[model samples]
Target: MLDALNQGTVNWSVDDIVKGINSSNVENQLQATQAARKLLSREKQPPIDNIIRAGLIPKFVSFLGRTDCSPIQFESAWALTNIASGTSEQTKAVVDGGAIPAFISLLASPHAHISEQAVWALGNIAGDGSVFRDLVIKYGAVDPLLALLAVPDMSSLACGYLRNLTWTLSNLCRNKNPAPPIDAVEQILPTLVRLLHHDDPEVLADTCWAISYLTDGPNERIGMVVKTGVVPQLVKLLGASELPIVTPALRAIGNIVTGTDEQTQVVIDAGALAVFPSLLTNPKTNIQKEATWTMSNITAGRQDQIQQVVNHGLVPFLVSVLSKADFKTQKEAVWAVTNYTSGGTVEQIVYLVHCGIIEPLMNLLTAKDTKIILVILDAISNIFQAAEKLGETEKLSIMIEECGGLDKIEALQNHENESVYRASLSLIEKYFS
Candidate 1:
């Protein structure tokens, strides 16, 4: 296809190229489609706007199924792939030009190159966002896409094909505003689980990311992902040396832990907690944030689960990040501590206090973010409640006052946000008095 298409660059003007694509002659049409692909393929400012404005998109869409003329179908798919790779409006033009069904049909083409070309085009379409993602799924693209993965004898080139296919799978599985229909997600869960063990890092990263999106919502959706037995694979990736694989692996695991208590335990049982000490201090702050978020969800579960968090010796790490990390990461770390206090036993709360959670909790009482302030207040209230229950409210109150928390709480009485003001007043009245 390259040799035939690259022989000589005809300096065909945009109008001439459009005229050539519209020509009845097969050879002229093939050259025109190749020309469109070339122009769209330019590394520096590809002429996507020129080509789309020239009205050659539907003309290119016209050749998508011309298997009898493989070069035309190949070049057209290639051109459409570049076009779809453009902005949302540009991708929408390709889809509106009736390219999806033809691209999907080519997924099963006898020629490997054509099927791979179709994957690239469809991937760009799905990558645009959820609207076009569901559009591709609506046109029945999922089964055949998954079928591409199971091809019995894949060559070295086919591995690259598999990488692109998994990337498209991630795009298809991504976005939550009106998430891809659950049934569509359900169909690919097993394939995603299998690909989790793929040798290629790209494939594993994309596969993990796909599962992350699949499990990002309702317990039912997460339950579907868990049922595929992907937890162990995801847990295994949490220890992966590569950050790309580890990040999404952590994300998927994070989402999983947000499911039912049993589902959350599935991750713990798979040994996810053992990796967190490192994930909490992962060089990337975002990784640190997600690690803490996952822990918060675990701590939010039943007592035994919170016990598991305690058993891991993560309290100090939670306090460390809560006190020093960025606001986003700190928020998750705060939840980890707060949830522990909310659900943990009086003894566990004592352990948290012993682990030096008090100074940080007091320090954050004056945090500018009201939500953090409120959660910190709740955590503080939980501590006092636990203290009162244990007949040690006065001792913990002294600890808070020494940390300068008394003045901060007093200052909050006049806070503009009513919730903060009320919470602060409730704390002082119920504890200080």
Candidate 2:
């Protein structure tokens, strides 16, 4: 059939295809759906996405709910699966047309083949966006999806089946709108965490990626993953050398450290201090950012942990990254420094001064981003705050002077933005006054 189509021997209008799909005769509908699937899955097509535009995909989605004809259910879902991989707008048509619910229903199918296609289609929909993904959650895809791995003979399924299942799951966990379905994702945390033991890079990477999304939520939610004992499994993933697996695994650890004190302590006890150095010295730029971002959260308002981070010997690494990173990564570097300064003890602040951070902090003040300047000022203010506690404010204050930081602050007092001007003057009043 595909070879015949390739030879330009088959011709069917979008209207006829839709008509045939809705026909009472099962064979004609099956044949039409199959032809449609074959054509859409073709590598490059002329604008037959117009057929999708003409309502072929939602038709596929609708046929998915009917189990009377298992072949139609399977074939229709397969077509929708391919269509779901099309442009975002094309997927939107299927999603908004109620295919998500249909996919969820089909996911509960007894037949593994139909359920497999449902998982594939829904994976594409969830990958589409948070709104569609939220629909997947709202309609209850999470429960059975996790249940797939635990059925008594779980090991007998094909490897590709397991991969698609895990990948679908990872996408379900992906969201940026502050995460409402965190509870749902949390229900599977133990299983998700345990999956990290799989030696397959694809499985390990997706599982860690799922961990990254779950932990990337509000601090309370992040604490759940931490409190669930997610760190140790995550530590094993980080301790290895699988770069593809290691990076997201490193990120999962990074997000874990951002939780509450007890939660952070869990990661600390699991040996993040040891993990931090390895990630920091990574040859990859992103790995450095992930490692530093973790350090930022680790040091955040935790005085004892700040000292531990310093003891981990990342002060020099932090300095190097801030001095050379682009605006975004430097922002993370400064935030890490800010965490140490604002949240550190007097000894920690004094220790940073000894490490020669004041000079570079002054250089970073020259950046054009107002937010970066504001944070740098916050770190500087924090240093002054810490120093005043030990009567060494002026001693630390003088270095900012010698590094020309006082002049830099003065130059900023006239900056066009009021926040910048006010922040600079605030620094000047505390340090140069």
Top lDDT prediction, candidate number? 1
lDDT of 2 at 148: 82
Q: Name the regions of candidate 1 deviating beyond 4 angstroms.
A: 1-10, 22-26, 43-59, 87-89, 152-157, 413-421
Clashing pairs in 2: none
**lDDT for each residue of candidate 2 in 1-433, tens digit (9 for 90 to 100):** 3344332113566666777778998877877777676666766763447666776766777788778888889877867767767778777666777787888888788898889888888888887888878888888888878888876544577778888898998888888774647677677787786677666778888989888988887887787787777688788778878898888888877777777887777887787678766777787878888888888888794788887778878788888777776666778889988888877878788888888888888888888988888889988888888788888878877888888888888889775699998888877776688
- Looking at model 2, report the run of 10 residues with the lowest lDDT sum: 1-10
lDDT for each residue of candidate 1 in 271-333, tens digit (9 for 90 to 100): 999999999988899999999999999999998888888898888889899889988998898
Please give the distance, in angstroms, between residue 6's alpha carbon in candidate 2 and its true position after superposition. 13
Candidate 1 lDDT (Cα, 0 to 1): 0.86
- What is the Å distance of residue 127 in model 1 from its true position? 2.1
What TM value does model 1 have?
0.90
Global fold similarity of model 2 (TM-score)? 0.82
Worst 10 residues of 1 by lDDT: 1-10
